Amino acid sequence: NLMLALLTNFTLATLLVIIAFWLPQLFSMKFFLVAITFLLFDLEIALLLPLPWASQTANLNTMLTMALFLIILLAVSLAYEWTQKGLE
Amino acid sequence: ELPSLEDLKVQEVKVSSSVLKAAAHHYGAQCDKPNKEFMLCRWEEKDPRRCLEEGKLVNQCALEFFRQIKRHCAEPFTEYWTCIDYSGLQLFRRCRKQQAQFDECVLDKLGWVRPDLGDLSKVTKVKTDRPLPENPYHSRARPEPNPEVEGDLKPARHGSRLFF
Amino acid sequence: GRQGRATFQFLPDEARSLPPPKLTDPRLAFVGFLGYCSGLIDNAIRRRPVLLAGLHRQLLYITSFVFVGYYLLKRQDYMYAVRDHDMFSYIKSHXXXXXXXXXXXXXXXXXXX
Amino acid sequence: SMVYMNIMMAFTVSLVGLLMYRSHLMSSLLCLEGMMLSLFVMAALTILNSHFTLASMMPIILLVFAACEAALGLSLLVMVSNTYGTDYVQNLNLL
Amino acid sequence: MINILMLIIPILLAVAFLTLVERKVLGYMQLRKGPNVVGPYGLLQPIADAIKLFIKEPLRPATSSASMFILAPIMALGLALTMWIPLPMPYPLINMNLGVLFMLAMSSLAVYSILWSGWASNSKYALIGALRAVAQTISYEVTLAIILLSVLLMSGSFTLSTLITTQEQMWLILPAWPLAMMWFISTLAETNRAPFDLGPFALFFMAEYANIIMMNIFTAILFLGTSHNPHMPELYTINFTIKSLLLTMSFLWIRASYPRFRYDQLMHLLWKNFLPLTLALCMWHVSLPILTSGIP
Amino acid sequence: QKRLGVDLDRWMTIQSAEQPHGIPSRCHAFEKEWIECAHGIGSIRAEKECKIEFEDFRECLLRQKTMKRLHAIRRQREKLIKEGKYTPP
Amino acid sequence: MLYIVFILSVIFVMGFVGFSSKPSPIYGGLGLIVSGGVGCGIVLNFGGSFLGLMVFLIYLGGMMVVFGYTTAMATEQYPEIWLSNKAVLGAFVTGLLMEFFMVYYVLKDKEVEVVFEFNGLGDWVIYDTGDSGFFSEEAMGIAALYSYGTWLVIVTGWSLLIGVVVIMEIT
Amino acid sequence: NPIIFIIILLTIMLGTIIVMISSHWLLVWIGFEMNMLAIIPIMMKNHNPRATEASTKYFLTQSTASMLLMMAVIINLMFSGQWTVMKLFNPMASMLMTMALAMKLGMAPFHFWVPEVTQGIPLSSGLILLTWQKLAPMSVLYQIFPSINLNLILTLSVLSILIGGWGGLNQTQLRKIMAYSSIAHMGWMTAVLPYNPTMTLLNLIIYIIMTSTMFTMFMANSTTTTLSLSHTWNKTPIMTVLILATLLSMGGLPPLSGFMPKWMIIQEMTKNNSIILPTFMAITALLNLYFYMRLTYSTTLTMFPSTNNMKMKWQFPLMKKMTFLPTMVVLSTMMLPLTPMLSV
Amino acid sequence: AERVAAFLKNVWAKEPVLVASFAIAGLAVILPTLSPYTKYSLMINXXXXXXXXXXXXXXXXXXXXXXXXXXXXXXXXXXX
Amino acid sequence: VMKXXXXXXXXXXXXXXXXXXXXXXXXXXXXXXXXXXXXXXXXXXX
């Protein structure tokens, strides 16, 4: 079971918190553009996810023209980013 | 619905282990005709209700193949079978040395036949059994569509609107 | 009414190009007047002297409305013919739907004053 | 039938959660993420049960366009916090 | 099921004994000596730090915002230990349908651990300082996703068990030669102190040191392996422990030798220097199994 | 469609179409009836000629008719509690 | 114990109860961690490991992470306790009574609803599939493909070009 | 802005092409959201507090519109399971389809955003991109003309002309009058859809051209009735004659070609034994005319807006379709009454 | 040369990582079309049967035989 | 079913010619431990 593996890790992690607490007795809009670029690149990576997974069966002449095309526009987006990006 | 009877399933089945059958793909070469008859029955008629007598021949021929291995060369076959289960999920790697011990024993018999290419869609011309067109699912022919208007259109009224 | 045995891409069907096109029609002349009218008020919005006597880019304004209007009328002559053709073919095929009544001298009430 | 009685109910609950307000404009965009999340599960169950194989790519595309709105609308929220002090529904000028 | 308990308690000991090796290797790199007064060779200090920090050392609350401050260690320690599950140590604990997808996701979910701790303090100077540290972790996970997707594109599916079979005679260091340099820098993402630095203090870095071992073993599978040998699991494990710890010394090497990059210039390392290089390699790794037949 | 796609292919929309490798649809056989029934405009505006083939196709995706049937068996199985009940397996 | 999907579906709605209620964007942010992570398990139970882990990589590994930034940019520092807030607890208590009261009627299998569809057993017909396929099957063994759907790759690329350019022009 | 403004503008043009040339349900879903990402930068433009408020009010209404539309797409998998845009096959999904498209258009219940969005638009170039945007939800409605219930379309069309006819009476803002004529005309759009789907496409042709002629003549900067007042004497007097041809045409007047929709919408409806609805259409249309009645007095009269400052230099705007389109907008009722066949 | 010799050595001096971004990605596009080796990869990709084989009923047909080893069908033997 | 109205014949489908998987959703209602093990390809995975 996967749930048996997960819960045992989390319950012992919370158990250490019980030991940690009970046992002792006595602004800037420029950083937002980073999060914007990250989220927009994630989806291009998400579209480029099935590369070592779909190439096994599908035609190569049809895929290669489209597979590189996603990485091209992933670099073209960065080419627009180069012209005045920021001081950070 | 009307299913098959209680005494329709063939006796003596699934005696071999899951990987014991996977150990020998010589079953694809010898005893292949009854397997192909059941295969051709399924693509023609999708229901399991009609193609079960062909499957009885499959189960009968399968036992005939394995009993030959039970009689002759039982020692190198079981050694290859203990090798195939000892490995994780590779199923063919780290067992090629004991694969050399196999086939060599079988070469004395006529049972030894290994393809180094595959199947690549084999045709069964000898098959008759039942005719293919017999309406597999269709009940109604579907009502005839709107008749196609043949002939060139001519202007008669020239606009049926309020004016001109 | 709606489209049945007709497809898009290239506005006239070309397969049903049998009917004769509009040649020197009064409908073409009125759009030609509108092409001239569009070449009159362009000198009114953009300040140019005399709508009748000004710059001669009006020849483009006359030709464009005639060119587009000709194919638009060609679409009109096509679609009205097809709508009529499908109407006539529906009566010829079914026959039972369209009923004919002939010869009647029925009595009707007469109004006074 | 069984599962669809909960995930459709979760969609209608989030539909109320969008249009109901307590002055916070951040919570509405957070519920737009939940709306796409509820649409993701409802689409997943329809495609995975009835083995489509081809339609499995469609919620992945839906996931991309989920994040397209929930970033470009989120960027406009920052512009409200640039012009005004703190983001509020009550703080408006349009008539 | 005793195996899960055999992958928490001896794993936490490896995190505990890391503090000695971090003090001893860096020590000998600085001509000073490691711990010696504590035990025979200072081996009794990891347990001594555990008694000191947990039992008598209290917590003076800055604000204690009800749900948070106690929730952030659960996202720290819990998610760091779940990463150990799908690891292809001879026969893994419940082998995943897709290995690396679980590896990349739980590492990207580990970003919350530093996020919720930023919310834990009321002071504005803490959270602005926290978001700056999130910005480093958020950016290098793009490169972490790209390099992984180009390594797997050479050979194997998402399963971690197939990554052993491809390295039967040849390591993946040599075909992915610029990526071997690239992945080593991108692993320094989860506040590794070598590129840049920002409940109680004790258990918070117990998860952070665990992630360092996690990336050290992850490098030792994706780039190392030598063989598998299903007959003897012992010969693989002895060889793996040497390969993994040699990379563990290298993380104690970069931290010892090299200063901070300046936060801005660390963000200039990505997008301007790293991302044009990795995407060009990603373009190159698409063409390779098509140019020459090799799509497993 | 408001504007048709002539001399170009961008469909792959309907179920039981061209498979990714050879993988079948769960309701492949039922649409082999449905598409063949309603390929003309006869049962498109009226939708009465293909009512028999639509009810079985609606049964394939929802399985509501089997759901009511299996519930009736399960309720009668619960009715056999402290009565004449027998379990073969 | 016997149910797998139905127990997780209740926790899924329970997360959305905190969205109908407005317990400040920080506690509402915790909803996407709870309902999102459980939302993976609902997808994972029917099959398709790839599609279930997509929420882990994007919603739980990007979307709410970026939403964590904007909570610090606007309406920050302290979240107000939902117990002290008026009508917020009222929306929470009415939200749970639309779900928990319904579950009692789902007991004994069949239940009456606003829609025509009934609840059913949801134990034997919970999977709704027999054997189907064999190798590289389960519908999502070959899930996403660049082949056949070549048009959809271009248009997704267009919108992701728009996103980078447009947000730069806004800020 | 250089090429990037044209590229963004071209993706709205491309976005509606995906909506027009389509067969898949998720394909049109993309087409709507391709516009959502692309209208917002033109909504902003001049870095305004009004532009930020309008775009946020525009997004939060139209993002919820798309997600309501996606629900109708998913119910189309719950029942039938066919992903071809032809019918909804549901009495439930048809409700969540029409109401979601009503949100994107200016239909009755979801109209509140329309006047306040139009006010926040910086320039006349951005004002076109709402009247042209309404082509996208109308194109889908033409595809799914059957299986959609009369009780929740015709009620939304009747109420929209009622609220549109009373929604511009207490308004003086030139943008606000155009925003409520939008709500008024959308009632005339969806009323045809059951009684033959044809003429709805022609109603677009008349509307889109007639609205584009307004804002291209509003290139001489005017936001209120009092700002468009100082135009008769201080500015050119021939410009007031050509706007008069567009003001009166928007209302139901037979010498002008803005009566050409009101020609066929009543005609097609009266064919199908309905007389009580077209009576209610034409009477409420006079309230739509009444806005332009008081707006014609800004151009026909003196009204005393002299202003001491006088312009000597001649005005040079864009005026791209400001000459070709008003000639067709003024007179086409005598030119092409047979154009019903040519368009649809 | 006006820019071939001029605007190449300047790129090596000023940010030489940008040289790698265009050259390696450039070779990723041009080389797949030039090389006469891509034909072999397509052959085995179609030859690998993921789905079960189907038998066709033959009535006077050529290039088809029994499942046993015989000179019939495709059966790729490209470099063993 | 002996006292009710159901005949347990003809099946739910009105076609009665195609006959699909049928016992994919059924697979016998009796003995829940066998039913849980049968539908556990994704869960546990052993």
Query: DSSP letters of D32-61?
Result: HHHHHHHHHHHHHHHHHHTT-SSGGGHHHH
CA distances in angstroms from F47 to B150, G104, H85, H335, listed in the order given: 26, 40, 17, 41
In terms of C-beta density within 10 A (0-12 exposed, 13-18 middle, 19 or more buried), how is residue D87 classed? buried
List the single best residue of H22, H76, H193, H205 to mutate versus F (max F Cβ within 10 A).
H22
Residues of A in contact with E145 (CB under 8 A): 42, 45
**Three-class secondary structure of residue H47 per DSSP:** coil
In terms of C-beta density within 10 A (0-12 exposed, 13-18 middle, 19 or more buried), how is residue G123 classed? buried
Q: Are H39 and G166 in contact (CB under 8 A)?
A: no
Residue C108 identity: X
Nearest CA-CA partner of F3 in C71, H193, H27, H337: H27
Q: Which two tokens stand for residue G6?
A: 């139905």
Q: Is residue D93 part of a domain?
A: no
Residue J33 identity: X
Beta carbons within 10 angstroms of residue C24's beta carbon: 6
Q: Is residue D95 part of a domain?
A: no
* Closest alpha carbon within chain I to A62: I42
Residues of I near B (CB-CB distance < 8 A)? 47, 49, 52-59, 61, 64-69, 72-77, 80
Nearest CA-CA partner of E229 in E220, E218, E237: E237
Q: Is residue D94 part of a domain?
A: no
Residues of H in contact with B163 (CB under 8 A): 337
- Residues contacting residue E247 through CB under 8 Å, at least 6 positions apart: E216, E219, E220
What's E55's DSSP letter? I
Specify the number of domains making up chain D: 1
Backbone angles phi, psi at B113, to 5 degrees: -155, 110
**Three-class secondary structure of residue A35 per DSSP:** helix
Residue A86 identity: G
Q: Are E6 and E200 in contact (CB under 8 A)?
A: no
Specify the number of domains making up chain G: 1
What's E271's DSSP letter? T
In terms of C-beta density within 10 A (0-12 exposed, 13-18 middle, 19 or more buried), how is residue E99 classed? buried
Residues of G in contact with J39 (CB under 8 A): 126-127
As a whole number of angstroms, the distance between CA E110 and CA E204 comes to 12
B12: left (phi over 0), alpha (psi -120 to 50) or beta: left
Instruction: State the helix-helix crossing angle for H276-295 and H239-250, rounded to 10 degrees.
Output: 160
> Across the interface, do F55 and J14 touch by the CB < 8 Å criterion?
yes
CA distances in angstroms from C16 to C2, C67, G5, listed in the order given: 17, 21, 60
As a whole number of angstroms, the distance between CA A13 and CA E75 comes to 9
User: Can you count the helices (H) and strands (E) in chain G?
Assistant: 8, 0
As a whole number of angstroms, the distance between CA G12 and CA H329 comes to 56
**Three-class secondary structure of residue B47 per DSSP:** coil
Q: Are D10 and G13 in contact (CB under 8 A)?
A: yes
From E68, E102, E118, residue closest to G53, measured CB to CB:
E102
CA angle, E74 then E78 then E81, to 5°: 160
Q: Is residue A23 part of a domain?
A: yes
> Across the interface, do D93 and H64 touch by the CB < 8 Å criterion?
no
Q: Which two tokens stand for residue C101?
A: 């009544």
Specify the number of domains making up chain A: 1
Instruction: State the helix-helix crossing angle for I17-34 and E275-291, rounded to 10 degrees.
Output: 20
Q: For chain G, where are the E strands, in sequence order?
A: none
Beta carbons within 10 angstroms of residue E201's beta carbon: 10
As a whole number of angstroms, the distance between CA J11 and CA J5 comes to 14
The position carrying tokens 């026909």 is: H300
Element (H, E) at A43: helix A32-47
Q: Are D93 and H49 in contact (CB under 8 A)?
A: yes
As a whole number of angstroms, the distance between CA B25 and CA E40 comes to 62
Give the total residue count for chain A.
88
As a whole number of angstroms, the distance between CA B74 and CA B59 comes to 21
Which chains does chain F touch, 3 or more C-beta pairs < 8 A? A, B, C, D, G, H, I, J
Beta carbons within 10 angstroms of residue H78's beta carbon: 19
> Across the interface, do A59 and I45 touch by the CB < 8 Å criterion?
yes
- Residue G136 near chain I (CB below 8 Å): yes
As a whole number of angstroms, the distance between CA I54 and CA A58 comes to 20
Instruction: State the helix-helix crossing angle for E72-82 and E112-120, rounded to 10 degrees.
Output: 170
E225: left (phi over 0), alpha (psi -120 to 50) or beta: left
Backbone angles phi, psi at C39, to 5 degrees: -90, 10
* Closest alpha carbon within chain G to I49: G135
In terms of C-beta density within 10 A (0-12 exposed, 13-18 middle, 19 or more buried), how is residue E103 classed? buried
Backbone angles phi, psi at I37, to 5 degrees: -135, -15
Q: Which two tokens stand for residue I48?
A: 């690998």
Q: b/e per residue, D30-59, with b = 16+ CB within 10 A?
A: bbbbbbbbbbbbbbbbbbbbbbbbbbbbbb
Nearest CA-CA partner of G21 in G85, G117, G65: G85
Q: Which two tokens stand for residue B21?
A: 């059958």
In terms of C-beta density within 10 A (0-12 exposed, 13-18 middle, 19 or more buried), how is residue B7 classed? exposed
Sign of the Cα torsion G43, G48, G50, G51 reads negative
CA distances in angstroms from G62 to B81, D56, E66, E111, E214, listed in the order given: 49, 22, 26, 10, 21
- Residue E156 near chain G (CB below 8 Å): no
In terms of C-beta density within 10 A (0-12 exposed, 13-18 middle, 19 or more buried), how is residue I65 classed? middle
Q: What is the DSSP string of E139-189?
A: HHHHHHHHHHHHHHHHS--S-SSHHHHT-SSS-TTTTTHHHHHHHHHHTTT
Q: Are D27 and G71 in contact (CB under 8 A)?
A: no
Nearest CA-CA partner of A26 in B135, E58, G138, C77: E58
Q: Are E172 and E220 in contact (CB under 8 A)?
A: no
As a whole number of angstroms, the distance between CA C81 and CA C83 comes to 6
Whole domain around residue D6: which residue ranges? Answer: 2-84
Q: Are G70 and D73 in contact (CB under 8 A)?
A: no
Q: Which two tokens stand for residue I40?
A: 């072999």
From F10, F62, F71, residue closest to G110, measured CB to CB:
F71
CA B63 distance to own-chain centroid: 18
Q: What is the DSSP string of F19-47?
A: -SSSPPPTTHHHHHHHHHHSSSSTTTSS-
As a whole number of angstroms, the distance between CA F18 and CA F26 comes to 14
**Three-class secondary structure of residue C62 per DSSP:** helix
As a whole number of angstroms, the distance between CA H126 and CA H51 comes to 11
List the single best residue of I48, I50, I57 to mutate versus B (max B Cβ within 10 A).
I57
As a whole number of angstroms, the distance between CA C52 and CA C40 comes to 7
As a whole number of angstroms, the distance between CA H70 and CA H97 comes to 9
Backbone angles phi, psi at H224, to 5 degrees: -120, 170
User: Domain holding A69: CATH number?
Assistant: 1.20.58.1610
Q: Are J12 and F69 in contact (CB under 8 A)?
A: yes
- Residues contacting residue F19 through CB under 8 Å, at least 6 positions apart: D53, D54
Nearest CA-CA partner of H114 in H42, H49, H185: H185
Residue A84 identity: Q
What's J40's DSSP letter? -
Residues of F in contact with J34 (CB under 8 A): 89
CA E38 distance to own-chain centroid: 29
Whole domain around residue G135: which residue ranges? Answer: 3-168
From C16, C77, C93, residue closest to B147, measured CB to CB:
C93
Q: Which two tokens stand for residue I32?
A: 């797949």
As a whole number of angstroms, the distance between CA H135 and CA H105 comes to 9
As a whole number of angstroms, the distance between CA H15 and CA H136 comes to 9
The radius of gyration of chain D from alpha carbons, rounded to an integer in Å, stands at 17
Chains E and I touch (3+ CB pairs under 8 A): yes
**Three-class secondary structure of residue H173 per DSSP:** strand
Q: Which two tokens stand for residue E86?
A: 């799908």
Residue G24 identity: S
Strand partners, H224: H173
List the single best residue of B84, B93, B97, B98 to mutate versus E (max E Cβ within 10 A).
B93
Residue F42 identity: G
Backbone angles phi, psi at H173, to 5 degrees: -70, 125
Helices (H), chain H: 3-20, 25-44, 49-78, 93-104, 113-119, 124-131, 135-143, 154-166, 174-190, 200-217, 239-250, 260-270, 276-295, 297-300, 324-330, 339-343
As a whole number of angstroms, the distance between CA H239 and CA H228 comes to 11
Q: Are H50 and H120 in contact (CB under 8 A)?
A: yes
As a whole number of angstroms, the distance between CA G72 and CA E128 comes to 9
Nearest CA-CA partner of E293 in G145, I80, I42: I42
Instruction: State the helix-helix crossing angle for F51-62 and F28-37, rounded to 10 degrees.
Output: 150
Shortest alpha-carbon distance between residue D73 and chain A (Å): 11
As a whole number of angstroms, the distance between CA E257 and CA H224 comes to 69
CA distances in angstroms from H149 to E184, E218, G14, H35, H87, listed in the order given: 62, 59, 35, 28, 12
**Three-class secondary structure of residue H224 per DSSP:** strand
As a whole number of angstroms, the distance between CA I77 and CA I60 comes to 27
Nearest CA-CA partner of J20 in G140, B35, G47, F59: F59
Beta carbons within 10 angstroms of residue H233's beta carbon: 16
User: Domain holding D26: CATH number?
Assistant: 1.10.287.3510
CA angle, H41 then H46 then H49, to 5°: 95
Nearest CA-CA partner of B27 in B84, B96, B112: B112
Element (H, E) at E18: helix E18-28
Q: Are J1 and F73 in contact (CB under 8 A)?
A: yes
Residue J41 identity: X
As a whole number of angstroms, the distance between CA E46 and CA E65 comes to 31
* Closest alpha carbon within chain F to H85: F1
Residues of H in contact with C72 (CB under 8 A): 336, 339, 342
Q: Is residue D49 part of a domain?
A: yes
Residues of B in contact with I68 (CB under 8 A): 29, 32, 113, 115
Nearest CA-CA partner of A3 in G37, D65, F23: G37
As a whole number of angstroms, the distance between CA H8 and CA H27 comes to 20
CA angle, B63 then B67 then B71, to 5°: 180
Q: Is residue A17 part of a domain?
A: yes
As a whole number of angstroms, the distance between CA D66 and CA H63 comes to 10
Q: Is residue A25 part of a domain?
A: yes
Q: Are D63 and A46 in contact (CB under 8 A)?
A: yes
**Three-class secondary structure of residue J25 per DSSP:** coil
- The torsion defined by the Cα of B11, B17, B21 and B22, in degrees rounded to 10, comes to 150
Sign of the Cα torsion H106, H109, H110, H116 reads positive
What's G55's DSSP letter? I
User: Domain holding G18: CATH number?
Assistant: 1.20.120.1200
Q: Is residue A1 part of a domain?
A: no
Strand partners, H173: H224
Element (H, E) at G160: helix G150-170
As a whole number of angstroms, the distance between CA G111 and CA H184 comes to 45
Q: Are J36 and G3 in contact (CB under 8 A)?
A: no
As a whole number of angstroms, the distance between CA E54 and CA A16 comes to 9
Q: Is residue D43 part of a domain?
A: yes
Nearest CA-CA partner of H230 in H309, H316, H147: H309
As a whole number of angstroms, the distance between CA G28 and CA G15 comes to 9
Stated in angstroms to one decimal place, the resolution of this structure is: 4.1
Strand partners, G113: none
Q: Are E37 and E43 in contact (CB under 8 A)?
A: no
As a whole number of angstroms, the distance between CA B118 and CA B112 comes to 16
Q: Is residue A41 part of a domain?
A: yes
Nearest CA-CA partner of D39 in E24, B160, G39: G39
Shortest alpha-carbon distance between residue A31 and chain F (Å): 41
What's C97's DSSP letter? S
Please tell me the experimental approach by which this structure was elucidated: cryo-EM
Whole domain around residue A55: which residue ranges? Answer: 6-83
